[PDB]
A and B are shown apart, each in its own frame.
With several copies, the nearest count.
Chain A
Amino acid sequence: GYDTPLGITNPPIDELLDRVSSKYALVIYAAKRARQINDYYNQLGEGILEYVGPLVEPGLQEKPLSIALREIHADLLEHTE
């Protein structure tokens, strides 16, 4: 019911506020998952017990914050308050 979100407005901030309780809680969900994806890309060539890789298909040279923000949008993560 809206034009295609371009750039940093995707995913739409409205839908992201549904899997989460508040604006502030979405920040921690995305940031901690972004650190997991970044640790996967840095521990992919060495070691085990590496963090879970990108749950969704990542785009080329996509920032871990963006991947994490789509995994949150696709209902692929949990939480613990």
Chain B
Amino acid sequence: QCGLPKLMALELFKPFVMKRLVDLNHAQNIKSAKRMVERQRPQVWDVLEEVIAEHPVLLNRAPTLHRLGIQAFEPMLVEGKAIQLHPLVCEAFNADFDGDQMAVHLPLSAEAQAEARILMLSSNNILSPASGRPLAMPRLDMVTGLYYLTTEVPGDTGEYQPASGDHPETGVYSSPAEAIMAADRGVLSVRAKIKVRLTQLRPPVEIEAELFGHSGWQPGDAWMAETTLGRVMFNELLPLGYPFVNKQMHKKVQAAIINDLAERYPMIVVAQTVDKLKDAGFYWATRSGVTVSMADVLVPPRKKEILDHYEERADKVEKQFQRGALNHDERNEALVEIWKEATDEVGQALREHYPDDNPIITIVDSGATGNFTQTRTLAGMKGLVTNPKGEFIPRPVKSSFREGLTVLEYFINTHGARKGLADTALRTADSGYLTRRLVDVSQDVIVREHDCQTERGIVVELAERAPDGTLIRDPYIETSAYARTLGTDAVDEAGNVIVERGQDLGDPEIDALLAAGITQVKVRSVLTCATSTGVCATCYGRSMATGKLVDIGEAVGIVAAQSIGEPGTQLTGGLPRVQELFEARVPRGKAPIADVTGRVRLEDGERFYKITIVPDDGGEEVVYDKISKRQRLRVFKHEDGSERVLSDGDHVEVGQQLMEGSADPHEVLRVQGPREVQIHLVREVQEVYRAQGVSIHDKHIEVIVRQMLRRVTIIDS
């Protein structure tokens, strides 16, 4: 639902209202029916309500970065002149309420209304199409409200007491309704730990097995739990039959639940469950006592002692600069590391001094909003500020904003603050320019076939095995392994296959291969998809927004271009590095590569650097010439030691990175082949977005690289 003003709906639905004014005989002819809407005769407000009934509208907030920037809603006639927006779709629109405006568009044709009702409805688009993780979830006040009641308090009133002496067990309630009556009178706290007999909540799959196991828990069966009254009220919100969760509801915990609800439970259940979480979060956020006051901003206890110790070290480095023992360029770097270490000690002096009841800590630690770096700046010290040059000033801002900056401290702070806002307008221009280049290069990439049948795929590092024998989950599972489809049966040490070919890698199906010992899978990729123009659905995989296999006809290329260009607003590598990769430029790093596998011949000096390689089979020596300003990459030598700095005698493979930097993708193609240069571009782009906190599935990056290698040149006619 959304709320639009009555005066907006009257003009938007003006011809429809005129039609109904003449049907119900409120107006003689369609001509006078128009004069009635223009004059706003009182009959139109009763007629307007009938018209907009179940007629969806489109809401849009510019900039339209991804497809969720436009969503469909059911209009509800509200008084006033402002549009009423649902609090859960704020994340998709990136819409705060500090003066934002949105546009409304009314679909007319039957097909357009059906496209809004089915394809664009806000309830049918809970997940992010870029990453598959939910967006319409508790985010600000709601997560704080839920984090409140799902907290265990050791000393809270009404807490369970073990039977001792003449009195039996205190704090064991027969029904949750009794616990509510206890909390109403004032005996029990919602956050106090107790024992309750539950009868309408499935116990955890851990304890459901020992109580029943043979048959599933039934609505009506009883069981005891050691939770709080709030945690029971929270578990009532999620649908019936969901395993009880006795955790503290952090944002990560709530996101995990909603992600699991979207995978297993149907769409309409997720849409209604998250509406319950919203109402419950806002209710308890009101009564969670979250407030900012000058008393709650606690200052570090050892504030003077810490700064005086580093003022001592700064005065010693200043005296080490008075005798000329330190270069002027080195004195700044020396003081920078003194004050960087000083801000870390003040930050640590704040974490331990601040209680967990303090609302400023509760906001940050519950995943609501804000960093502790902001909290440190608030109560501890601003730290080293940057001048318009870029390097940190050798003198930091010792005061905190709670204390109050001095005149010169404030003046030097504005230098970094203004240039922080200034370059943001230029960085968004280059972001949007890169985005529209990606849109045009992949605009016509459509899913036209169900399965192209090619057994080709690519190997994905599912997990890494430690020396002891434990298998460590690979960090790239989320973006490269999940939501894929298999192109080769997964075989463990036994002859049995765990997952068949062509099965969407769900959440438990990854743990099936994880617990089977196998650490590598061959999955179907859009890179290897052999189709004339578009791509097949089987090689694409699961639609991150739909949670199922992609439908035939979905413009996955535009979705991919939007998925990459939406987070491009925040970068430092950096944004030019992303442009260096997508434009196939000869990079700044210009790192060399091993054209032929063999033996390393390191002939290093100081005037320059030259390195040869004896081919491991035939061939002749290949001589290079490199500047001494670079350094060799620690190559995973055959010795199984990854930190083997490339010295002469190492056994490097073909297409191995020699020195650090960025290897020329043009040269990577003419060495290892088109299949490998595509993998290089994918995880090289992915390293830039991963190093910023943005999770884009490799699927979308691969859709762009597929278009970069569609053409070949002619050598002989």
Q: Which residues of B contact A27 (CB under 8 A)?
A: 111, 114-115, 118-119
Q: Is the CB of A31 within 8 A of B272?
A: no
- One of B74, B114, B115, B266 near A7 (C-beta < 8 A): B74
Q: How many A-B residue pairs have CB under 8 A?
A: 81
Is B271 interfacial (CB-CB < 8 Å)? yes
Residues of B within 8 A of A14 (CB): 266-268
Contact B54 A13 (CB under 8 A): no
CB distance from A59 to the nearest CB of B (A): 10
Contacting residues of chain A (35-59) with chain B, CB-CB under 8 angstroms:
35, 38
Q: Which of A12, A22, A38, A66 contacts B268 (CB 8 A)?
A: A12
> Among B111, B119, B121, which residue has its beta carbon within 8 angstroms of that of A8?
B121
Q: Which of these, A5, A16, A23, A63, contacts B119 with CB under 8 Å?
A: A23
Does B181 touch A at the CB level, under 8 Å? no
Cross-chain contact B114 with A23 (CB below 8 angstroms) = no
Cβ-defined partner of A24 (8 Å) among B113, B266, B551:
B551
* Chain A, Cβ-Cβ closest to B115: A27
In the complex, what residues of A have CB within 8 A of residue B109's CB? 31
Interface readout for A10-31 with B: 1 if CB under 8 Å, 0 if not?
0011101000011110111011
Contact check: which of B1, B74, B117, B121 meets A65 at CB < 8 Å?
Answer: B117
Q: Which of A8, A12, A69 contacts B74 (CB 8 A)?
A: A8
Verify A66–B110 contact, CB threshold 8 A. no
User: Which B residues are CB-close (under 8 A) to A5?
Assistant: 268
Closest residue of chain A to B76 (Cβ to Cβ) is: A7
Contacts of B1 in A (CB 8 A): 7
Q: Is A9 located at the chain interface by the 8 A CB criterion?
A: yes
Chain A residues near B123 (CB-CB < 8 A)? 9, 13
- List chain A residues, Cβ under 8 A from B553: 22, 24
B111 touches A22 (CB 8 A): no
Are B267 and A38 in touch, CB under 8 angstroms?
no
Interface range, B side: 20 to 34
Chain B hits for A12, CB < 8 A? 266-268
Q: Does B110 lie within 8 Å of A2, measured CB to CB?
A: no
For B551, the chain A residues whose CB sits under 8 A away are: 21-24
Asked whether B362 is an interface residue with its Cβ less than 8 Å from the other chain, the reply is no
The smallest beta-carbon distance between B22 and chain A, in angstroms, is 15
**Any A CB within 8 A of the CB of B235:** no
B267 surroundings in chain A (CB, below 8 A) = 12-14
B56 adjacent to chain A (CB < 8 Å): yes
Q: Give B110-131 interface residues, CB cut-off 8 Å to A.
A: 110-111, 113-115, 117-119, 121, 123-124
Contact residues in B for A8 (Cβ distance below 8 Å) = 54, 56, 74, 117, 121
Contact B119 A9 (CB under 8 A): no
User: Which of A2, A12, A32 has the largest count of B CB atoms less than 10 A from its CB?
Assistant: A2
CB-based contact A65/B110 at 8 Å: yes
B197 sits at the interface (CB 8 A): no
Contact call A38/B272, Cβ cutoff below 8 A: no
| Residues of chain B within 8 A of A26, CB atoms compared | 114, 118
Decide: A7 and B118 in contact? CB cutoff 8 A. Answer: no
- Residue of chain B at shortest CB distance from A21: B551
A2→B239 contact, CB < 8 A: yes
A3 in the interface, Cβ–Cβ < 8 Å? yes
* Contacting pair A35 B118 (CB below 8 A): no
Residue B331 interfacial (CB < 8 Å): no
Q: Does B55 contact A (CB under 8 A)?
A: yes
Pairwise interchain contact A63-B552, C-beta atoms closer than 8 A: no
Q: Does B177 contact A (CB under 8 A)?
A: no
Is A34 in contact with B114, judged by CB distance below 8 angstroms? yes
Closest chain B CB from A1 CB (angstroms): 7
B515 within 8 A of A: no
B53 at the A interface (CB under 8 A): yes
Q: Which of A16, A21, A30 has the most chain B CB atoms inside 10 A of its CB? A: A30
- Contacts known (A63-B53, A66-B54); A24 close to B268, Cβ less than 8 A: no
Query: Which B residues touch A23, using CB under 8 A?
Result: 118-119, 546, 551
B62 CB contacts on chain A under 8 angstroms: none
Chain A, Cβ-Cβ closest to B268: A12
Say yes or no: B121 contacts A34, CB within 8 Å: no
CB within 8 Å of A: which B150-180 residues: none
> By the criterion CB–CB under 8 Å, are A63 and B54 in contact?
yes
How does the 8 Å CB contact mask read for B66-79 relative to A, with 1 for contact and 0 for none? Answer: 00000000100000
Let me know if B269 is at the binding interface, CB within 8 A. yes
* B 264-305 to A, binary, CB cutoff 8 A, 1 in contact else 0: 001111011000000000000000000000000000000000
- Is A24 a contact of B119 with CB atoms below 8 Å? yes
A-B contact pairs, 5 of them (CB 8 A): A9-B271, A26-B114, A31-B113, A35-B110, A65-B113
- A-B contact sample (8 more), CB < 8 A, given A7-B54, A8-B121: A1-B239, A2-B266, A8-B54, A12-B266, A16-B118, A23-B551, A27-B119, A66-B54
